[PDB]
Ligand binder design. Structure first.
Ligand code: BCL
Ligand code: BCL
Ligand code: BCL
Ligand code: BCL
Ligand code: BCL
Ligand code: BCL
Ligand code: BCL
Ligand SMILES: CCCCCC/C=C\CCCCCCCCCC(=O)O[C@H](COC(=O)CCCCCCCCCCCCCCC)COP(=O)(O)OC[C@@H](O)CO
Ligand SMILES: CC(C)=CCC/C(C)=C/C=C/C(C)=C/C=C/C(C)=C/C=C/C=C(C)/C=C/C=C(C)/C=C/C1=C(C)C(=O)CCC1(C)C
Ligand SMILES: CC(C)=CCC/C(C)=C/C=C/C(C)=C/C=C/C(C)=C/C=C/C=C(C)/C=C/C=C(C)/C=C/C1=C(C)C(=O)CCC1(C)C
Ligand SMILES: CC(C)=CCC/C(C)=C/C=C/C(C)=C/C=C/C(C)=C/C=C/C=C(C)/C=C/C=C(C)/C=C/C1=C(C)C(=O)CCC1(C)C
Ligand SMILES: [Fe+3]
Lengths: 49, 47, 32, 38, 302, 306, 38, 38, 38, 38, 38, 38, 38, 38, 38, 49, 38, 49, 49, 49, 49
């Protein structure tokens, strides 16, 4: 677990930290895409009305 | 005219007869085997 | 009489349940 | 000894009795003969 | 020596404490008189003997009174009073619903009431005699518990439901092929007894009971006369389904599913008589539970 | 010649998965064994699993199509949603639209493959772990009834509509409709035989489980050992049933009784269901000619009217 | 001794009681006598 | 003892109680007497 | 000895009682005699 | 020997009794004889 | 220790998700707000 | 360690997929958008 | 090895067969082609 | 033995039989060929 | 390692196949495209 | 359990304390977002009326 | 102690949640308040 | 069970006492909120009438 | 495996090779018969239309 | 593993490589046949319309 | 795991890396084909309208 910050060493393995980084970046990219999709769908047809 | 149909008989009554008879014979042989003498743990000892 | 007697008989049906429930609780308590 | 003789006897006798009863009942129910009140 | 086994296999004795013991020896070792329910209550069981293989207790004598009287009352109502001479066409009917809960020797349906009372005495005596014989053999009370489940199924159908309905003509007729007419007319009066949830649970447990019976007979017969380590059936049941319940677990589940089926069943017919008249109308609340009321159009709304 | 550890802990196809076994805990306390254990994946389990998955997926997305693709109407009507077989018109034809029985035919075919390959899995794992194949043949009897319901009775009647409609409420509706269409299944004599064997199945299961739990203190449940030499618990069980009803079974006979009562349930049921449509169109009318119907000249109908 | 005397006594007494009850109930239900309003 | 006095007492007392209850119930259900509003 | 005498006695006595009851019931239900108000 | 004599006796006697009952029942239900009220 | 932290986390998270779904459903089916053409 | 990372990953991914499917199906069935002829 | 070739073969072959059957089934039921009198 | 020849034979033969039955069934039910009086 | 590569491959491939089938079926049933006779 | 305050040492592991901190902060953020959402939905369409 | 604290906590929390849901649903369905367009 | 008062030492563990304190304070806060909610709902629409 | 070609020796037993040869020849004969049957059924009633 | 290229030696047995070659060639033949079938069915009745 | 880069050595076996490479390239090819299919289906019949 040398790659893990010592704050998260009790929780994250060395390999689990890299997979967690991938998951975090994927969640962030998906969030940006979801925000863009929501803005586009609102400009198209507002659902709240 | 008092007689059920051949179909009725075959279906109901010879399966009825078979079930009753066969059950009785299967019980006879079930208990012949169960009351025969075979390896048991002697009750005076094991219990 | 309709609802009083009906509910007493209902409770007898559930009482009939009861012995099996005692069996399950017996298994649980005696397998510790 | 492929078959016990007692087994073949039991099976044949039971089959014959069952078939005699079945054929009697089929013939009596057919009403084709006038036996026991038509 | 041949060394005969319980299964029927003769294994040639080398290829345990077991000896070939006669059953007569087993039977006489375990007699142990005076442990029955009646012997606790009165200090003695009035009938503490065996008539042949059967144990005759106080509740065995009560049960045999019930059996003989029930058979004779059944056959009186249906040979006489009905004239049928064939048991598939006879019709052992309770008193009409017009009569209510009271019983009249002069009115028809009196011999159904007697057959039902004697059959109840016979069944309860059989149950209490099973308690007797389990007490004699220091066994658990599980067989009486299961038989009590089915006896309470009988009590519900002939005593509890007819009383709660209040007419005594709501008990089912005691006719071969004709109690089926009652079952069909009751099942369709409260239409779609399939939609009765305690009935669906009862059917589920009946089908599961037959399935567990087949699976258990299969499992024990499959390991019966083989060189097996007693863990082969467990490995088989973990390779199939990924779970082996074990030896004590399958018999517990057997007993429990068996009993629970008829318990939920008698809850179904009792509710069907008294509280629920229509089992399709019962399910009217579901589409109106407020979490999905609003979402639908056309035929897709409710 | 059979490694019990290898059969539980081999890897891959013709091996097991979930191999580090979990413990449920409450299953151990209530049932005596809590190990979920590894489960085998053996080229018949794979066919079974993926064909069942194809079947269930077809059924579920047709449920979705039927609710207009609304996942709440889905949850609300899930128990009354069903994928019905093709209607009586164009009855055996497979050129039926997808919504009018087209989805039912595909799903039922994949289900047929699933049950057949599950039978093969039962058989091959019984042979692989050294036990007899009694379970595969019990499943074959159950499958006789199943294939009469879904394949052999629809055929020989000329329409797929004779088969159930793949739903929680559709099977109940199917049973109702089939007994109604063919008179009264109560007077189907093989239906009466199959009910005899089903209620005797539950009766023997309850009796057997109760007897073994009652004689459990003396280890009556270890049937494998008791079949080699009968211990005191099995002796007490035999004596209980001898004194109650005048005859008894041993550790071995009772399971023959169990197996055969269940198998007869399935077999007599298959026979009766196949007879109802093809040979005897009406069971009550047949019952009157069979003299098994009780005359009911003046019924008291006050009981059946509110 | 083929038959314990106690067994014969129990069987005979129970048979007699059951038969007395059965015959009383058959006769009372027949309405042939005008007994207990018959 | 095949014929214990306690056994005979239990059997006779239970038979008498059961018969008294049975006869009371048969007589009350017959409606032949006008007892308890009949 | 093929048959215990007690077994034959039990079987014969039970068969005779069952047959007497059956024949009485058949004859009484036939209404052919005018016995017990026909 | 193939058959215990007791087994053959039991089977034959039971078959004869069952057949006598069955034939009596069939003949009486046929109404072909005028026995026990036509 | 009365409660494993993992157990409390699972229970609280599942309860919150179930309640969010239930409340969303109830509010959407009420038709009381113009959400999703309502 | 209260929670295996693999468990949290499985649960979160399955919850996200189920929620995406549910929301897509609710939005498509609402007919509020004119998507896929709605 | 992490992946057995036999496993991939079984999975791919079964997936291909299931998909061929499904697509044939969907195309035949669509009635879009006039194949087997459509 | 990564692949047993007996396994491939069983699977191929069963698949071929099932497919022949299925295709025969589909072609017969289609009514597209006037077989056995359509 | 937290996640076997074979497990991720199986899960991803099965999810992709299920999603492709689901989306194809939703799009085909929508009748929004005029594909396979709309 | 060093990172845990001694008040909560009988209850919280070292790793469980960090995950609890994440859960608490997530619950607080979700609460703020829920309050904002409720105020917006009230300004839009009051449900109590 | 007569009661584990965890058991009392589970029971009380579940009872409170069930009662809150029940009371909310009874009050909503009563239509007595004009909440969620009533 | 040191933190527990000796009156309740037969009943409460050391960790169970802290969780019981949390439960008690949560119940009290919920009770205050419930009283406020009932007063508001009464001022809005009296249910007893 | 003296009868199996070396190429297929890792896969085929000596007896499995003969049964495979039978299976292959049966499949080929069945294929010829199936082609003939399809040509005949097409000349009779074309299913493609 | 001799017959397997070194690149794929960690993955393919000696016998698995020959069966893989058969599977690959079968998939390619089936693909060619599937392309031909799709072109024929399109020339017959276009499904896209 | 020599063929695996050092960053992913804790996660990927030697054989798992090659199968991962195949999976990645297959996913990329399928993505390109999916984008082309979506553009074609949009040019044919826009679903968003
Ligand atoms: C129902 C079966 C009965 C039985 C009934 C008979 C009868 C009956 C006979 C024998 C006879 C024989 N049985 Mg034996 N047998 C039984 C059990 C056994 C068993 C056994 C496994 O234990 C065995 C080993 C035997 C063995 C034998 C031999 C001892 C002997 C010679 C048979 C022979 O050569 O056949 C060769 C002959 C044939 C196979 C001819 C086949 C006949 C076919 C059916 C044509 C018949 C034509 C028909 C008569 C014409 C019909 C016209 C109509 C009138 C219109 N039986 C069972 C219990 N058995 C025979 C005997 O002992 O001779 C004194 C004989 O008569
Ligand atoms: C009335 C004419 C009816 C008909 C009604 C019957 C009836 C009724 C019966 C048969 C039976 C038979 N029929 Mg026919 N049968 C008809 C038309 C045909 C035709 C034809 C194509 O036309 C054929 C080939 C047959 C063929 C047959 C044989 C299957 C059989 C007679 C020989 C046999 O094997 O058993 C020979 C029988 C024996 C060897 C049994 C011997 C038993 C001994 C004698 C004991 C008898 C019981 C005795 C009373 C017990 C006393 C015991 C005391 C303790 C002493 N039937 C027509 C339609 N058929 C008989 C049969 O048995 O079926 C199996 C029978 O029951
Ligand atoms: C009203 C007239 C009704 C009728 C209603 C009844 C009723 C009601 C009863 C009988 C009972 C009997 N009837 Mg009658 N009976 C009728 C017509 C008849 C006819 C006839 C052909 O007409 C006959 C022969 C009989 C014959 C009989 C006997 C079977 C019996 C009375 C004597 C007996 O043995 O028990 C004698 C009884 C005893 C020896 C018991 C002594 C018990 C002691 C005294 C305790 C009594 C309980 C006491 C309150 C407990 C106190 C305890 C405290 C701790 C101190 N009845 C008519 C139809 N009959 C009685 C019976 O007991 O049935 C068994 C009874 O219950
Ligand atoms: C529109 C107004 C509607 C209404 C519609 C809703 C809706 C809709 C919801 C609630 C919910 C709630 N409402 Mg309300 N509510 C109304 C009227 C009321 C009234 C009142 C008497 O009037 C009250 C007291 C409440 C009370 C509440 C609480 C029960 C709850 C909000 C706080 C909460 O505990 O969860 C706080 C929530 C959190 C702490 C969860 C935090 C989760 C984090 C932020 C993740 C969110 C999911 C995220 C997208 C996942 C991303 C993961 C990616 C991997 C990164 N509502 C009116 C009728 N109410 C909300 C709730 O959650 O129910 C449990 C909700 O779903
Ligand atoms: C008629 C046109 C219909 C249609 C009907 C079908 C049908 C029907 C099928 C497909 C199938 C497929 N179609 Mg399409 N298809 C259409 C429109 C499309 C469109 C498009 C957007 O328009 C696309 C992209 C596809 C895409 C595809 C692929 C999924 C697949 C063909 C290649 C494949 O992978 O399997 C290639 C197949 C193989 C590699 C298998 C090789 C098997 C070998 C040759 C054995 C064959 C069995 C043989 C008889 C057994 C003999 C054994 C004896 C022992 C010797 N279709 C239109 C709507 N499509 C085919 C498929 O297989 O689905 C998986 C198929 O069944
Ligand atoms: C009438 C025309 C119908 C039609 C009806 C049928 C029927 C009917 C069948 C097929 C079958 C098949 N059809 Mg088609 N088929 C049609 C249109 C098509 C089209 C097309 C796009 O138009 C195609 C590509 C196919 C493709 C195919 C193949 C899947 C298959 C034939 C070769 C095969 O693999 O099995 C080749 C078969 C063998 C190798 C088996 C060899 C078995 C040996 C010869 C034993 C035969 C049994 C024998 C009697 C047993 C004797 C044993 C004794 C002990 C001696 N059909 C039209 C719609 N099709 C056949 C099939 O088998 O499906 C799997 C079949 O049953
Ligand atoms: C026609 C337009 C329809 C529509 C119909 C479909 C259909 C139909 C599909 C999708 C699928 C998808 N669509 Mg869409 N889609 C639409 C609108 C949208 C919108 C949008 C907001 O408008 C979005 C964001 C999406 C998003 C997506 C992604 C979820 C996905 C495509 C990329 C993907 O991940 O899988 C990329 C796919 C791969 C990486 C798989 C690669 C597989 C390889 C190439 C093998 C293919 C099988 C091959 C034939 C087997 C041969 C084996 C032989 C042995 C050789 N769709 C409109 C409504 N959409 C596709 C999907 O796969 O769903 C998961 C699909 O099935
Ligand atoms: C009312 C009638 C019921 C009473 C009928 C039985 C009478 C008692 C019979 C006692 C004999 C007995 O026990 O019967 C046994 C067979 O029982 C058996 O299952 C016989 C089982 C009989 C089934 C009776 C069915 C009851 C019907 C009620 C419903 C109609 C065989 O007995 P033995 O090997 O001799 O062992 C006893 C010896 O020690 C004494 O010689
Ligand atoms: C219309 C219809 C249905 C007609 C039906 C027609 C028929 C069939 C009638 C049947 C009649 C019959 C068979 C009646 C039976 C009467 C009997 C047996 C009475 C018993 C009395 C026994 C008695 C009173 C016993 C008393 C016992 C006592 C006092 C015991 C006392 C005691 C004993 C011994 C002790 O421990 C110690 C002291 C104590 C007092 C407690
Ligand atoms: C319409 C229709 C269907 C008509 C059907 C037509 C048919 C088929 C009729 C069939 C009739 C038959 C088969 C009748 C059977 C009659 C019999 C078997 C009578 C038995 C008597 C047995 C008797 C007397 C037994 C007595 C037993 C006794 C005396 C017991 C004795 C004793 C024993 C054994 C003891 O230890 C000690 C007590 C005691 C000494 C009394
Ligand atoms: C008719 C009507 C309208 C009725 C309604 C009236 C009623 C009765 C309303 C009821 C309200 C109630 C009871 C609401 C309850 C809300 C709850 C329990 C929310 C839970 C939040 C739990 C939360 C946020 C849990 C978050 C979990 C997280 C952040 C997990 C974190 C994580 C875990 C645990 C790990 O592994 C590792 C770290 C990581 C961050 C990944
Ligand atoms: Fe068992």
């Amino acid at each position: 677990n040398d790659l893990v910050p010592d704050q998260w060493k009790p929780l994250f393995n060395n390999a689990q930290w890299l997979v967690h980084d991938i998951v975090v970046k994927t969640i962030y990219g998906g969030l940006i895409i979801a925000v863009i999709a929501h803005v586009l769908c609102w400009a198209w047809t507002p659902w709240i009305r | 005219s008092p007689w059920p149909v051949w179909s009725g008989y075959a279906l109901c009554f010879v399966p009825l007869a078979a079930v009753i008879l066969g059950f009785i014979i299967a019980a006879r042989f079930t208990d012949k085997q169960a009351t025969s003498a075979y390896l048991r743990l002697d009750p005076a000892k094991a219990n | 009489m309709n609802w009083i007697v009906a509910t007493f008989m209902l409770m007898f049906v559930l009482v009939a349940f009861l012995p099996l429930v005692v069996s399950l609780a017996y298994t649980w308590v005696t397998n510790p | 000894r492929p078959f016990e003789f007692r087994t073949s006897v039991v099976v044949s006798t039971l089959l014959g009795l069952v078939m005699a009863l079945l054929i009697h009942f089929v013939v009596l129910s057919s009403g084709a003969f006038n036996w026991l009140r038509a | 020596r041949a060394l005969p086994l319980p299964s029927g296999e003769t294994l040639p004795a080398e290829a345990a404490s077991a000896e070939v013991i006669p059953f007569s020896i087993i039977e006489e070792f375990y007699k142990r008189p005076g442990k029955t329910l009646a012997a606790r209550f009165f200090g003695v069981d009035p009938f503490d003997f065996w008539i042949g293989r059967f144990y005759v207790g106080l509740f065995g004598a009560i049960s045999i009174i019930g059996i003989i009287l029930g058979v004779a009352f059944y056959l009186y109502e249906g040979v006489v009073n009905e004239g049928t001479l064939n048991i598939l066409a006879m019709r052992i009917e309770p008193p009409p619903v017009s009569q209510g809960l009271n019983v009249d020797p002069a009115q028809p349906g009196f011999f159904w009431f007697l057959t039902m009372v004697a059959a109840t005495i016979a069944f309860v005596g059989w149950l209490l005699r099973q308690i007797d014989i389990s007490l004699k053999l220091d066994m658990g009370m599980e067989v009486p518990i299961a038989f009590g489940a089915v006896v309470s199924s009988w009590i519900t159908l002939q005593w509890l439901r007819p009383i709660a309905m209040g007419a005594w003509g709501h008990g089912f007729p005691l006719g071969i092929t004709h109690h089926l007419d009652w079952v069909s007319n009751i099942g369709y009066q409260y239409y779609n007894f399939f939609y009765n949830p305690f009935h669906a649970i009862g059917i589920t447990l009946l089908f599961a009971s037959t399935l567990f019976l087949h699976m258990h007979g299969s499992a024990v017969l499959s390991e019966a006369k083989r060189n097996i380590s007693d863990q082969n059936i467990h490995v088989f049941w973990r390779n199939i389904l990924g779970y082996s319940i074990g030896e004590i677990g399958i018999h517990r589940v057997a007993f429990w599913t068996g009993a629970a089926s008829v318990l939920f069943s008698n809850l179904c017919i009792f509710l069907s008589g008294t509280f629920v008249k229509d089992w399709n109308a019962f399910w009217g609340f579901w589409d109106k539970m407020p979490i999905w009321n609003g979402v639908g159009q056309g035929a897709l709304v409710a | 010649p059979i490694d019990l550890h290898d059969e539980e802990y081999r890897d891959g196809l013709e091996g097991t998965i979930a191999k580090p076994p979990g413990h449920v805990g409450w299953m151990q306390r209530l049932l005596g064994e809590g190990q979920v254990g590894p489960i085998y994946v053996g080229l018949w389990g794979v066919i079974s699993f993926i064909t069942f998955f194809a079947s269930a997926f077809i059924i579920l997305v047709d449920y979705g199509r039927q609710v207009g693709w609304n996942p709440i109407i889905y949850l609300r009507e899930f128990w009354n949603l069903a994928v019905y077989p093709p209607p009586t018109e164009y009855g055996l034809s497979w050129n039926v639209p997808w919504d009018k029985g087209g989805a039912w035919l595909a799903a039922t075919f994949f289900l047929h493959i699933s049950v057949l390959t599950w039978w093969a899995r039962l058989y091959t794992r019984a042979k692989a772990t050294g036990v007899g194949t009694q379970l595969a043949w019990g499943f074959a009897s159950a499958l006789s009834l199943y294939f009469v319901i879904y394949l052999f009775h629809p055929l020989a009647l000329g329409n797929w509509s004779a088969a159930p409609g793949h739903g929680f409420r559709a099977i109940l509706d199917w049973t109702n409709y089939v007994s109604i269409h063919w008179g009264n299944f109560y007077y189907n004599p093989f239906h009466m035989l199959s009910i005899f064997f089903l209620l005797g199945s539950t009766l023997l299961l309850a009796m057997h489980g109760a007897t073994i739990v009652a004689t459990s203190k003396w280890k009556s449940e270890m049937e494998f050992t008791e079949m080699m030499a009968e211990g005191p618990g099995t002796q007490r069980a035999q004596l209980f049933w001898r004194w109650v009803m005048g005859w008894n079974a041993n550790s071995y006979n009772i399971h023959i009784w169990a197996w055969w009562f269940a198998a007869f349930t399935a077999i007599t049921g298959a026979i009766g269901l196949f007879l109802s449509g093809t040979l005897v169109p009406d069971w009550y009318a047949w019952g009157e000619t069979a003299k098994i119907v009780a005359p009911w000249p003046n019924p008291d109908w006050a009981q059946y009217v509110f």
